[PDB]
Every structure is written in structure tokens, then in C-alpha cells.
């Protein structure tokens, strides 16, 4: 709690619905929004805050709170959007030897600056004299270690919770989020958002050599005729759906009723019959 | 509430080993299970903190191992004549006060702190229901603006209570017994710190009494130095 880390994690695709099934977590609640909209909301870098309480002080980690923790070793003003999760980690950090490792820093002159790491082992002087190093009366250590032990019930365990501060100052977002994809259909004239490109077309297999940094590709007057596939490098064909002119043949409505029906621009496969220019 | 027995007369100095059931658990966290021997007039002086490592005091009380769910004072063999009620601290859950217990009559016979730092108390002599009255322990020694200090009060007949829970700067927990009607504000940072009465509700009767330490989360801080009370005696 006195050394948390401060792991600037950023350029990634953050699915946070895996944390969902890596490890048996106690504690999911997010403050900011909710983790269904989370996937779809890019950010600049997100701020990993690490540390180990019991399970009595899991209630003070808040947006604001007072209390032995919440205010002496780590505070979170009223603007966190992360989450809070945690988890009971009384597994592997408690044996029967001696836990005079840890410590949460009982002693202090007054609230610190919330998001703030204050690394320092001098001894706590309680005013009013000089304290050069001395240990009695006056001025004693700031520190005190857990009693973290096996054989105890829940509540005064060693629970590891795990902060992801989030912010937006004015520089582009690298996080993200997951995206996925679908199955590719040749053609037919279907719906494409390649990379943000919306449009409609039969996507078909063409012969173009892309240069190896051209993703996009357009025409002689302002129309997009043929993209680069996200996935493994395949040169693909964008032309626009069936569409065509309705005209109607008729010899007059004085000697019958039969009618024919031209459709324009169609090699009559993609709608007696016949194939004209 | 805690388990504590009424009285303890029989075979004096011998097998009284007076304890505190009612625990149930591993008392929370950090065991740390202290004796206060309040005795009339005076106020209390405390005996030891720990399961073991006595202060410097008398050296006859001692071995107080945690047995089974409950400390086991050690007793036997300290004195024939003793007038006073002994008192113990556990269940050191997050924010939970009423840590003492109950009146234990330990009475080996029945028949038969002052210049370490600072001891003043305001004096509230006939104090007139409701109103706001002051109560400062001025220390002209330790720092009264930078230990952790507490307000724990008793009544005649009922056991002792915490009352209030001051930290440094930025901590001002109040008790479930005033359930807000109580609220604490420090005097200058460098003269005392005083507290506030903010219309009691006829329960506020009982003597204060002024720490300069905290109880259930007590420190060794050198020394246990306490503080007289004075009567408020209500008119309502």
C-alpha cells in the first residue's frame, strides 16, 4: 500500500470481458460505466494501481472516503471511471513463519494528495523535539507489518485489489478495445465496413498489385473500387451492387395485353429470355 | 456486548485467572487484547497491551496467553488486598466500537500518570441540559495535534464505551451511541484540542475521559497516560 505500482499499459486491444474467467475475483464493480459499453470506448493509457489490504478495508477503497487506508496510503477522488476489482489471494501469501513484510504506514501527519505514492522510511517525530533517530517517547516507526496467518477466517485476509484509472487529456486514444469479423462472402452483393469504409458491393477477387503500405483504393473520379482485406493480404474487388433501368414494351392497349420487361445492364444472371447489348 | 463474569471473590490470589469470553473468532486481525484496571477516583492506569512484554509496572501480572477464544490473564500469586474492575479490549473489527465490557468485581479482599505529561479537564459543574459545552485535556508535553487520541466515557454501574475517534488530520469518526448528534472540532494545532457537547440527549451524563492513546488499536506510544474526569450532572 506504501509502494503501489504505477504501470502506464497502453497500444493494446483491452477485452475486458476475459477478466471475467481468468482468476476467481470477489469484486468487479466499476464506478465509471458499464463493462458492456466499456469494449466499445477508446482511451489514451490506462493506470494499473496494485496493492494488498484485508477484507474489512476492501468498503474504504471508494471515490472518496475516510479511514486508517483510505486516506494514508492510497485515496481516488470523485472523478474515478476504472473499476475496483479484487480478489482474495489467501493461497500462496500466507504461511506459518512470520509475515513481518508488509505494512500499511498506521502513522502519519495528515491526508496526502489522492494518487499519490509516498516512499519513505523516516522515523514519524510527533513535533515538539528534535528527532535526529531515536526510538522512545517522542518518536517511534511509522510502520506497522499485518498478522497475515493461515489459519484465520475471512475478513483479515490478504486481498489484492487492482485499480485501472482511466484518462482523456489531449492526445489520441491507443486503447481501445476488442473488434471483431465475420465470414467473407464472393459474389454477392452484400454490406462492407472495412476499416470504418461503409458501403454495399459484390466483393470479388481481382488481380491488382497493392503497393505493401496502401490499405485503401479509389478511381480515376472519386469512387472506391478496391480495398486491402484486414485479414492475411488477399487483393479483393469492390464493384457497386445490381441496379439497372426498368423499360416496358408494349404495342398498344387496343389489340392486346401482353407486355415485355427489359432490365438494363444485366447478363440476365443476376435478376422467354433473352441477352442483348 | 461481550462475556465477562459479574464478580471474582473465591479463592483470592490463587485461581482467579479472570479472562473475557464472547469471542467466538481469532479476535479479527492483529491480536492485541489489552487490561485496564479502572479503580475508583483516579482515572484508570493500563497493565499490559499484548499477550506478553509487560510495561514497566508491576512485574506479579503477567503470561496472559489467549486461550481457546479468549485472553487468560494471569492473576494468581499479584496481591491479597485490590479495589478496582478490570477491563478488556478485543473484537478490533473495521469500525465497530463498545470494544470494553462489562463490570467485573475482581475484588481480592473487598476491605482493603500525574506529572508524566499534562491532566486538565473543563469541569462541567451543573451543566445545563443541552447547550454546547467544552471539554479540552491541554497537554504541555506530547503533541496534541499529531498522536491519535480518543474520548471514552463511563457511567456509574455500566462498563466503559467508545465514544470517539480521532485521527491526524483527516478522520472524524463518531460512535453509534450518538449516531451524529456528536461532532468533534480541534482547537488550534498548537494550544489543545477540544470537544463538543452539540445538544446531548440526556445520556451524555456520565464522566469523560480524555487519552492521549487509542484503545482497541493501541500503541505502545511510550506510555499510558490518562486523565481525571469530571461530573457532568445533567438537570433535565
Known amino acids: 500500500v506504501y509502494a503501489w505500482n504505477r504501470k502506464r499499459i497502453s497500444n493494446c486491444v483491452a477485452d475486458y470481458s476475459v477478466l471475467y474467467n481468468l482468476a476467481p475475483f470477489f469484486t468487479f464493480k466499476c464506478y465509471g460505466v458499464s463493462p458492456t459499453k466499456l469494449n466499445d470506448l477508446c482511451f489514451t493509457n490506462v493506470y494499473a494501481d496494485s496493492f494488498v489490504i484485508r477484507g474489512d478495508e476492501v468498503r474504504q477503497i471508494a471515490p472518496g472516503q475516510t479511514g486508517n487506508i483510505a486516506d494514508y496510503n492510497y485515496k481516488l477522488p470523485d472523478d474515478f471511471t476504472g473499476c475496483v476489482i479484487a480478489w482474495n489471494s489467501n493461497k500462496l501469501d500466507s504461511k506459518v513463519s512470520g509475515n513481518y513484510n508488509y505494512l500499511y504506514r498506521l502513522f502519519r501527519k495528515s491526508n496526502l494528495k489522492p494518487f499519490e505514492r509516498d516512499i519513505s522510511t523516516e522515523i514519524y517525530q510527533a513535533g515538539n523535539k528534535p528527532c535526529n533517530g531515536v526510538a522512545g517517547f517522542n518518536c517511534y516507526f511509522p510502520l506497522r507489518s499485518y498478522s497475515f496467518r493461515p489459519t484465520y477466517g475471512v475478513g483479515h485476509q490478504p486481498y489484492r485489489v487492482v485499480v485501472l484509472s482511466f484518462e482523456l487529456l489531449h492526445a489520441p486514444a491507443t486503447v481501445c478495445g476488442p473488434k471483431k469479423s465475420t465470414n467473407l462472402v464472393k459474389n454477392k452483393c452484400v454490406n462492407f465496413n472495412f476499416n470504418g469504409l461503409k458501403g454495399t458491393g459484390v466483393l470479388t477477387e481481382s488481380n491488382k498489385k497493392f503497393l505493401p503500405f496502401q490499405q485503401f483504393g479509389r478511381d480515376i473520379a472519386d469512387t472506391t473500387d478496391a480495398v486491402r482485406d484486414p485479414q492475411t493480404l488477399e487483393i479483393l474487388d469492390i464493384t457497386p451492387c445490381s441496379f439497372g433501368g426498368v423499360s416496358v414494351i408494349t404495342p398498344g392497349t387496343n389489340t392486346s395485353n401482353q407486355v415485355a420487361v427489359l432490365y438494363q445492364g444485366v447478363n440476365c444472371t443476376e435478376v422467354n429470355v433473352f441477352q442483348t447489348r | 456486548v461481550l462475556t465477562q463474569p459479574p464478580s471474582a471473590s473465591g479463592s483470592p490470589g490463587q485461581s482467579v485467572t479472570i479472562s473475557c469470553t464472547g469471542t467466538?473468532?481469532?479476535?479479527?486481525?492483529?491480536?492485541?487484547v489489552s487490561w485496564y484496571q479502572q479503580h475508583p477516583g483516579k482515572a484508570p492506569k493500563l497493565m499490559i497491551y499484548?499477550?506478553?512484554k509487560r510495561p514497566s509496572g508491576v512485574p506479579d501480572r503477567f503470561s496472559g496467553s489467549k486461550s481457546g477464544n479468549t485472553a487468560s490473564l494471569t492473576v494468581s500469586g499479584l496481591q491479597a488486598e485490590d479495589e478496582a474492575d478490570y477491563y478488556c479490549s478485543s473484537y478490533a473489527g473495521s469500525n465497530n466500537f463498545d470494544v470494553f465490557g462489562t463490570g467485573t468485581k475482581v475484588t481480592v479482599l473487598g476491605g482493603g500518570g500525574g506529572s508524566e505529561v499534562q491532566l486538565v479537564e473543563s469541569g462541567g459543574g451543573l451543566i445545563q441540559p443541552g447547550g454546547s459545552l467544552r471539554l479540552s485535556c491541554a497537554a504541555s508535553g506530547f503533541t496534541v495535534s499529531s498522536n491519535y487520541m480518543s474520548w471514552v466515557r463511563q457511567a456509574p454501574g455500566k462498563g466503559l464505551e467508545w465514544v470517539s475517534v480521532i485521527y491526524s488530520g483527516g478522520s472524524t469518526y463518531y460512535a453509534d451511541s450518538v449516531k451524529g448528534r456528536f461532532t468533534i472540532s480541534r482547537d488550534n494545532s498548537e494550544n489543545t484540542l477540544y470537544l463538543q457537547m452539540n445538544s446531548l440527549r440526556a445520556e451524555d451524563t456520565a464522566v469523560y475521559y480524555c487519552?492521549?492513546?487509542?484503545?482497541?488499536?493501541?500503541?505502545?506510544?511510550?506510555?499510558?497516560?490518562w486523565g481525571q474526569g469530571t461530573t457532568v450532572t445533567v438537570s433535565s
Open positions: 487519552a492521549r492513546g487509542e484503545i482497541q488499536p493501541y500503541y505502545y506510544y511510550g506510555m499510558d497516560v
Open positions: 467466538s473468532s481469532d479476535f479479527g486481525g492483529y491480536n492485541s
Open positions: 499484548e499477550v506478553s
